Design an enzyme around this catalytic site. Structure first.
Site, PDB file in Angstrom:
ATOM      1  N   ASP A   1       0.843  -1.177   0.000  1.00  0.00           N
ATOM      2  CA  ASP A   1       0.000   0.000   0.000  1.00  0.00           C
ATOM      3  C   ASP A   1       0.893   1.246   0.000  1.00  0.00           C
ATOM      4  O   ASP A   1       1.478   1.609   1.030  1.00  0.00           O
ATOM      5  CB  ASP A   1      -0.914  -0.075   1.241  1.00  0.00           C
TER       6      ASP A   1
ATOM      7  N   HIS B   1      -9.192  -0.240  -8.458  1.00  0.00           N
ATOM      8  CA  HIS B   1      -8.715   0.852  -7.603  1.00  0.00           C
ATOM      9  C   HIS B   1      -7.712   1.717  -8.350  1.00  0.00           C
ATOM     10  O   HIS B   1      -7.785   2.948  -8.302  1.00  0.00           O
ATOM     11  CB  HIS B   1      -8.129   0.304  -6.301  1.00  0.00           C
TER      12      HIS B   1
HETATM   13  C1  HEM Z   1      -9.666   1.155   2.174  1.00  0.00           C
HETATM   14  C2  HEM Z   1      -8.993   2.184   1.652  1.00  0.00           C
HETATM   15  C3  HEM Z   1      -7.865   2.009   0.621  1.00  0.00           C
HETATM   16  C4  HEM Z   1      -7.087   0.947   0.356  1.00  0.00           C
HETATM   17  C5  HEM Z   1      -7.087  -0.418   1.037  1.00  0.00           C
HETATM   18  C6  HEM Z   1      -6.181   1.308  -0.729  1.00  0.00           C
HETATM   19  C7  HEM Z   1      -5.234   0.463  -1.258  1.00  0.00           C
HETATM   20  C8  HEM Z   1      -4.437   0.749  -2.341  1.00  0.00           C
HETATM   21  C9  HEM Z   1      -3.436  -0.139  -2.944  1.00  0.00           C
HETATM   22  C10 HEM Z   1      -3.131  -1.564  -2.449  1.00  0.00           C
HETATM   23  C11 HEM Z   1      -2.870   0.506  -3.976  1.00  0.00           C
HETATM   24  C12 HEM Z   1      -1.754   0.001  -4.950  1.00  0.00           C
HETATM   25  C13 HEM Z   1      -0.327   0.379  -4.522  1.00  0.00           C
HETATM   26  C14 HEM Z   1      -0.113   1.881  -4.547  1.00  0.00           C
HETATM   27  O1  HEM Z   1      -0.376   2.539  -3.504  1.00  0.00           O
HETATM   28  O2  HEM Z   1       0.311   2.465  -5.599  1.00  0.00           O
HETATM   29  C15 HEM Z   1      -3.512   1.811  -4.033  1.00  0.00           C
HETATM   30  C16 HEM Z   1      -3.225   2.774  -4.950  1.00  0.00           C
HETATM   31  C17 HEM Z   1      -3.743   4.043  -4.942  1.00  0.00           C
HETATM   32  N1  HEM Z   1      -4.789   4.513  -4.150  1.00  0.00           N
HETATM   33 FE1  HEM Z   1      -5.651   3.560  -2.557  1.00  0.00          FE
HETATM   34  N2  HEM Z   1      -6.454   2.624  -1.115  1.00  0.00           N
HETATM   35  C18 HEM Z   1      -7.478   3.068  -0.284  1.00  0.00           C
HETATM   36  C19 HEM Z   1      -8.069   4.294  -0.309  1.00  0.00           C
HETATM   37  C20 HEM Z   1      -7.789   5.257  -1.236  1.00  0.00           C
HETATM   38  C21 HEM Z   1      -8.494   6.516  -1.419  1.00  0.00           C
HETATM   39  C22 HEM Z   1      -9.690   6.924  -0.549  1.00  0.00           C
HETATM   40  C23 HEM Z   1      -7.903   7.169  -2.427  1.00  0.00           C
HETATM   41  C24 HEM Z   1      -8.219   8.553  -3.068  1.00  0.00           C
HETATM   42  C25 HEM Z   1      -8.593   9.609  -2.350  1.00  0.00           C
HETATM   43  C26 HEM Z   1      -6.830   6.325  -2.890  1.00  0.00           C
HETATM   44  C27 HEM Z   1      -5.972   6.656  -3.881  1.00  0.00           C
HETATM   45  C28 HEM Z   1      -5.023   5.844  -4.448  1.00  0.00           C
HETATM   46  C29 HEM Z   1      -4.112   6.301  -5.475  1.00  0.00           C
HETATM   47  C30 HEM Z   1      -3.987   7.688  -6.125  1.00  0.00           C
HETATM   48  C31 HEM Z   1      -3.274   5.092  -5.820  1.00  0.00           C
HETATM   49  C32 HEM Z   1      -2.167   5.063  -6.885  1.00  0.00           C
HETATM   50  C33 HEM Z   1      -2.869   4.745  -8.209  1.00  0.00           C
HETATM   51  C34 HEM Z   1      -1.821   4.736  -9.292  1.00  0.00           C
HETATM   52  O3  HEM Z   1      -1.543   5.836  -9.884  1.00  0.00           O
HETATM   53  O4  HEM Z   1      -1.257   3.617  -9.528  1.00  0.00           O
HETATM   54  N3  HEM Z   1      -6.771   5.165  -2.147  1.00  0.00           N
HETATM   55  N4  HEM Z   1      -4.450   1.933  -3.026  1.00  0.00           N
END
Ligand code: HEM
Ligand code: HEM
Ligand code: HEM
Ligand code: HEM
Ligand SMILES: [Cl-]
Ligand SMILES: [Cl-]
Ligand SMILES: [Cl-]
Ligand SMILES: [Cl-]
Ligand SMILES: [Cl-]
Ligand SMILES: [Cl-]
Lengths: 309, 308, 308, 308, 309, 308
Positions: E148, E221
């Site tokens: 994450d 996601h």
């Molecule tokens: C339960 C809540 C969340 C979980 C478990 C979660 C989990 C993850 C995981 C596993 C990744 C892939 C690895 C990485 O960080 O690049 C990811 C990517 C990402 N997440 Fe979350 N996330 C959560 C909430 C959010 C929220 C609320 C937002 C936006 C406000 C968000 C925005 C992003 C963004 C911008 C990426 C990178 C996407 C990319 O350009 O590859 N996340 N998230």
């Protein structure tokens, strides 16, 4: 052996403190000293517990003259003052000391703090006659630039070599430790080539490999400190030497400390080093190293140490 | 002792987890709980092996009532429920608990993960009744600001103090553990001078040096927790206390946990603490600390645990 | 446990060096080999002592045939060359090896340096037939992505499983070690789903949890390598497997190594794996992994090794 | 900033070495000293590169008198010898020193080794006049038992406070450093209550929290070392103090070292400390601490140092 | 940026503390709050200096309602309360908070001690409405078992994404941070196969590799949180989420915290996650994660933070 | 400096992976190569982020000839294939290479995993022609037993020496890198005395001190690799050499890698080494070391690499 006094078998450390003290003449002085050393587990835990790793240790040694002031009727078999030696050019003097604290830890502050508490508890009852702040120097090297402690026995062999056994049951688990503060002539040693230095020591400089049989001088440090009795049985000691020095006074030193179940072994190694085998065939390390101190102490086991007084 | 259940003699850790549970009334709940605790080396290794250093430990305790449900035939000599104490000012309640998991590691994530697996496996067969996430606080201090654990016995003394031996040979290698979750009144504690606090504990604060005999108050924590029998022999316990808290609920705590081959030693410290020695001369630490829980467990050796 | 050769019971390390050598047929060769291995504590200390933590260790194994050249008068009860296997689909080759050096440390340089010195000191008297540089891969995983080594016995269990005892008193403290250099078919393993991979191994992949009894295939690596005898008693090995590989030659390996007080346990394991139990019901791990070597050695105790 | 000489802004270290030297009167001594300090990156890298982490730093200071011998043409705006102070009770002596080496590392051996090489290279051309081996003491405390360095400026504030800028552009990147070796009267310090000690310093002892405005005495160490100009702008210095001592000589010390782009800031702290503000209202820290030395050096930037 | 408040760009840590507080209604309360946050460098160094490594950091965020109570005439361009969202089955509530402290260190005790000093300094002037103790979980994973934070921008890109620039000069170096405390349904998530979980996220589970273009769901996601404007310019946020939970209450959570120079980017990512692209094509992570909080704060630069009052 | 590709200025690491590949002649091949390397931040973060310390780094180099296939319109001022050398005794071969991946981390597994993923993502589009697993050897030494990398430029000096500046503005922040896989004649090097070895290198062996000017051979590695131009100005390269080896194949290597804003500096160095200065007066290091490869690459800045 986490935070227990008289842990003779501890592996080497990044920092050490060697304190040698002389006890005052009075009965009050003798009682204070006893009170402090027999309760030495107190300061040890007071300081050592504060580091999660529990690396701090403290070995207490007691000199023969002081032993007889406090335990006149029960005495370990081989407790006597350090035997001085005089070769034609190099000598091992016998210098004062009633108390040894050999303190080790992963950090300087821990060694310092324990020394501070110990000295504070003794107040006027004892005087520091020698104090050396040891430090690890690169990859376990001494200031001569050689790895120092390589062939030390470990685990069971360390226990066999260092710790009193069935020979002297009343003091089983105790030891005999000898210290000598050596100061080096760095200039003279630097005028030798590495290959010459290796012949003095008995091992290669960088790689720390023992010279093979046919290239190994009869007067090398290693040859002269190899002790094989008539029955062909090898006799080892456990050493924990450390670098020390002062840049302003130009002191570059090795603090020799060696533990044995019978100081006869350490004594013979010294006799060989200083007087030679055959006679005159002495240890050339002594052309570059001069002992400023020489003191022997008895290291009581925890049980015996706690009883003093 | 690497990744073995019931490792009572582990040194302090950066992190710990204390989980107290009550088992279900049903015969099925009993069997699930017994299946889980008897095979506890599974989850222990499943999580623990993932750390090179192998710092993870897990000690399982069983309460007197639950023990009777599963081994009606043989009992450890001293297993009974925790004895409440009512002192002149303070009291130690006796609170429920059939199971204790005392989990320690170098990292929170290993504790939490082991806890997760254990709770998951127990499912509906048990309920978490107390849970506290302990943590090392600076140089081995508690939230009162004193180094906490200094005089723990170590190595052989630790084994002599904590582990059942020849006196109850059927349960050799076991121990008895008592837990109490204490909450502190921090602002009251802070109205004291450092010297006052030192007199309450029995040791200097920053430097952690025991007060000398003639400056040690008769009611100091150290004095009252000194147990010497008629032959002059001291009897020690092994403590693994940790800080915990919650800043929002203004909770600042010390989770007490003490192991002994005979809990009467621990119990006598508690009596001397809560009722005083002489009576009325009680531990002032209790003026700033209130135990919210109090529970006794038997700690079976691996062999005995594995056969439950 | 520091810097003593033949330390079988050492915990996982970040780096590994596995060296297998064949001896010269000569008599000087037999003598040089004997001088080097009987004084192995020399180079071990020569290298190990340079690291404050003293992590370096070195287990020396002697093949059955070379043992006979060197101590004909006396032999361990269960020494023999590696029994090869030819099964329904897959085969375990018995390959050459007189000397095994199982080397571990916290650092690569220490492994390599020790290796360098053992090789230099043997000179022409012996030849390297297999060299493997093992490494820790993330949280104790193999290159199949599973945590590798989880259920290893530890402490007293580990001693009882690996070290020769009362049953062969002349060789007490020794062990028997089997190595196999496995290479993996990565693309084929990757065509499996995680759940299929879990079925093959016997454990969940990320969480490293052992499958429930009802979900556990009769041919999973775990079931096939589980040994329970006719009295209900379990028998275990101590493994120190490590990943290794080369990117340009596309090799991705698990270097298997296992120690037992009796090779019969390991050999049964290997039979159940290659032949199957019931027959034909073989270890599916073998579909994605091919043993490129196979060799047994006796691990003499330190005493027995030093007189040779 | 890895292994670069004159790295004034390095964070605190576990170990340090403070070497103060006087140069010989001869033109040859001058040239040797200049050759050594101008090529100081040599020994710095020769020792420092040997540690993976590269923690070794070395700051060279030059005294006013020696500076005049080597760069008679251009002088830093504020270079002059240390100004002695005679207060109503305590005095800060001005003591000799042509050269300062302020050496810091994660390990004693690196400091000592760099010192060894530097002294060796200077040979007869200089003499060591003060040498102290500093060491981290618990959680960043001095031997008075207080966290020492808390309010050091950091990052940009550190650079603004310590490094010469537009106000003296010919020596941009340099600094001015003042050292004083203090010895403490430990038993006198210990007769004070913790609260008394807190009032002397200006911060709570264990918790290192600044006393609030209405509890802060006017003569507290913190109060007197607060420098605020007429426009209300605070002026800060950068301190790298370390504990040192000798248990045999009963020496318990704090080696003070303070860097500033304008030493008048440091000097004004000293005046306010030794003479008081208002006069007579001096720093009580000086009732338990006696400066045995006092010396001012200019710290040339690398460019300027390299051309000496 | 050693021991300086408002270090938005710090790399991930083993421990974190997220504290959200509501300020009291009074003028005294407003002044105390200002005094504490504008002098936040005090507690920061008081605690952080005690660890040699200097890992401790503290970012202060200020809510829109509280900002207007204290800096009525000078306001960052985009400071407004958190915009709530309601999809048909999943919602992002907007919950109270005037103060955020986002505290990070290599150790728990450091985070705890700073939180303790901060809460103590505020006394009756503010109330804690949310408190989460974050921890690193294995190899930078969340409790869903995926790594994450992987694609977080670093170094210069982190500065570009997170920090106010020439667009709003009066607040250059500030940021906008949004928090949401998510709780997971672990059971329901465990009923999915790894391959399904990978389709939800957009990356492989163990190996943390992005799914290639043709296997990447339009509702993953990763796809929904990819933000490309019309000019084809990518817009990123800086996230520092951490695991948290309570075994007894069965809470297994992810504390989302994300920083942006313009909360419009974060807001659009949320809109895409909750309402879908195309509409209804929402982020399936929300079938397994339910936000219990939602608050936006302005992160003033050090200079602006020090001026408050 | 965390997890950003093309980070040339990274400090020494405990582990290294050097990968050299040749591209397919095809157009899909050219395209796959471009997708993989222009998005190299993907796999770098995919692996690196898993380690708290974020030590993983990856510099991508592009050979002159493959650069032309991919960006014909625009080219760095000094890009060309590796100029081979044929001198009196020893020769530097110019070998094939289109792609260089210079990978470093605190751990081996991180290096290998990143490598694994770069290789997998290129598939058939490219072939590994040279793979080297570099390791730290004791206190930053090479396998010749000398500290290797001591005089490397650092910080601002390192940037000025290695990174393209105002002189080629379209490629600002890029670099030119030369690799050479050297193999050593260990037995021949060991027949030298330490003092002879010191004469060959230019520095004392254990202490890593540069020889005095009067004792410094005109053909020592140090003198020959010292570059001072006609204005008296020095020119430096940034090297990241690592040990590597195989015991059974008796290879003991130094993998040379050096970066410069202009290859002319490195190339002069190599000429002085192989041809000698004056001619015939060549680098004696070359008597004990044989270059088995020789390849130049352009290191694009992160911007330039991402658009390709
Ligand atoms: C339960 C809540 C969340 C979980 C478990 C979660 C989990 C993850 C995981 C596993 C990744 C892939 C690895 C990485 O960080 O690049 C990811 C990517 C990402 N997440 Fe979350 N996330 C959560 C909430 C959010 C929220 C609320 C937002 C936006 C406000 C968000 C925005 C992003 C963004 C911008 C990426 C990178 C996407 C990319 O350009 O590859 N996340 N998230
Ligand atoms: C200036 C003082 C000394 C120096 C620099 C020194 C240095 C060394 C070195 C470099 C070694 C080889 C590595 C190893 O420790 O095995 C060694 C070995 C040894 N030294 Fe010393 N030593 C000193 C004093 C002494 C003294 C006074 C004794 C005897 C009382 C002694 C007894 C030994 C022994 C027993 C060995 C191991 C020999 C073997 O069995 O290989 N050393 N010493
Ligand atoms: C509010 C809860 C408690 C706090 C904050 C506390 C704190 C401390 C401290 C600071 C010390 C001195 C350092 C040390 O040696 O550990 C100590 C000692 C000790 N405490 Fe506690 N304690 C608590 C509860 C208890 C309880 C409930 C018991 C017994 C059941 C206990 C038994 C002991 C013992 C046996 C010692 C060592 C005494 C000695 O022999 O010197 N403590 N405690
Ligand atoms: C016996 C020698 C000294 C001792 C034991 C000592 C100790 C301390 C302590 C415990 C603090 C509070 C923690 C901190 O912020 O560092 C402090 C602060 C400070 N000291 Fe010293 N100090 C000594 C000498 C000096 C001298 C000679 C100077 C000036 C030349 C000085 C200047 C300062 C300054 C500027 C502060 C920060 C004040 C603030 O802005 O809060 N100290 N010192
Ligand atoms: Cl010390
Ligand atoms: Cl936990
Ligand atoms: Cl290796
Ligand atoms: Cl030093
Ligand atoms: Cl916290
Ligand atoms: Cl690799």
């Amino acid at each position: 052996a986490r935070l227990a006094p008289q842990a003779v078998l501890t592996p080497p450390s990044a920092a050490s403190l060697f304190l040698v003290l002389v006890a005052g003449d009075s009965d009050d002085d003798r009682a204070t000293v006893c009170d402090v050393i027999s309760g030495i587990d107190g300061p040890l835990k007071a300081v050592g517990f504060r580091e999660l790793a529990g690396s701090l240790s403290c070995v207490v040694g007691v000199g023969a003259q002081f032993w007889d002031r406090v335990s006149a009727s029960s005495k370990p078999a081989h407790l006597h003052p350090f035997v001085p030696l005089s070769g034609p050019v190099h000598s091992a003097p016998s210098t004062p000391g009633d108390l040894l604290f050999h303190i080790k830890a992963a950090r300087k502050d821990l060694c310092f703090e324990l020394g501070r508490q110990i000295v504070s508890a003794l107040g006027s009852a004892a005087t520091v006659v020698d104090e050396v702040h040891g430090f690890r120097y690169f990859d376990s090297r001494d200031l001569l630039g050689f790895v120092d402690g390589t062939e030390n026995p470990t685990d069971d062999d360390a226990a066999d070599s260092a710790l009193i056994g069935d020979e002297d049951p009343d003091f089983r688990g105790g030891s005999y430790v000898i210290v000598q503060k050596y100061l080096h002539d760095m200039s003279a040693w630097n005028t030798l080539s590495t290959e010459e230095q290796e012949r003095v020591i008995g091992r290669t400089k960088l790689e720390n490999v023992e010279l093979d049989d046919d290239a190994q001088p009869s007067n090398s440090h290693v040859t002269l400190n190899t002790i094989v009795d008539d029955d062909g049985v090898e006799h080892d000691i456990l050493r924990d030497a450390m670098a020390f020095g002062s840049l302003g006074e130009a002191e570059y030193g090795t603090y020799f400390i060696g533990y044995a179940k019978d100081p006869a072994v350490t004594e013979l190694m010294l006799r060989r080093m200083f007087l030679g085998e055959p006679p005159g065939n002495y240890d050339r390390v002594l052309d570059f190293s001069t002992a400023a101190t020489g003191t022997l102490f008895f290291v009581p086991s925890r049980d015996v140490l706690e009883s003093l007084g």
